[PDB]
Amino acid sequence: TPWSGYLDDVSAKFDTGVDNLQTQVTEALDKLAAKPSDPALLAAYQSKLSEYNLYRNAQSNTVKVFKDIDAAIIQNFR
C-alpha cells in the first residue's frame, strides 16, 4: 500500500483539491501552440498558468511551514 505521511497527506489534499489543473494547463498550452492570437484560450492560458503558479507556491509553502513546525517539535524533545 502507498504510504503517506501528514505532509504527504497535505500535498495529496492539494492534488485532489484541483480536478485536472496539470491536465488543464496541458491542453491550454497545446491549444495555444497552434492558435497563438485567438481569444478565449489566451485569457484561459494566462488564468490557468497563474492558477498553477499560485497552486505550486501554496503547496510548497504549506509543506515547508508544516515541516518547520514538526522540526521544532522534534528538536524540542531534548
Partner: protein
C-alpha cells in the same frame, strides 16, 4: 465648344474623383490597426 467644355468638365469630375477615392483609401488602408493594435495584446500572455 459648349458641348466640348461639357465633355471636358465630365472628364475633370472623373479625374478629381481622385480626392474622392484615393483620399479615403489612404485612411481605409488603416484597417491594419486590426493587426498592430491586436498585436499589443501580448499582455494576455504577459
Amino acid at each position: 465648344k459648349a458641348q466640348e467644355e461639357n465633355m471636358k468638365t465630365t472628364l475633370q469630375t472623373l479625374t478629381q474623383k481622385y480626392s474622392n477615392a484615393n483620399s479615403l483609401y489612404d485612411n481605409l488602408v488603416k484597417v491594419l490597426s486590426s493587426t498592430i493594435s491586436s498585436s499589443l495584446e501580448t499582455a494576455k500572455s504577459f
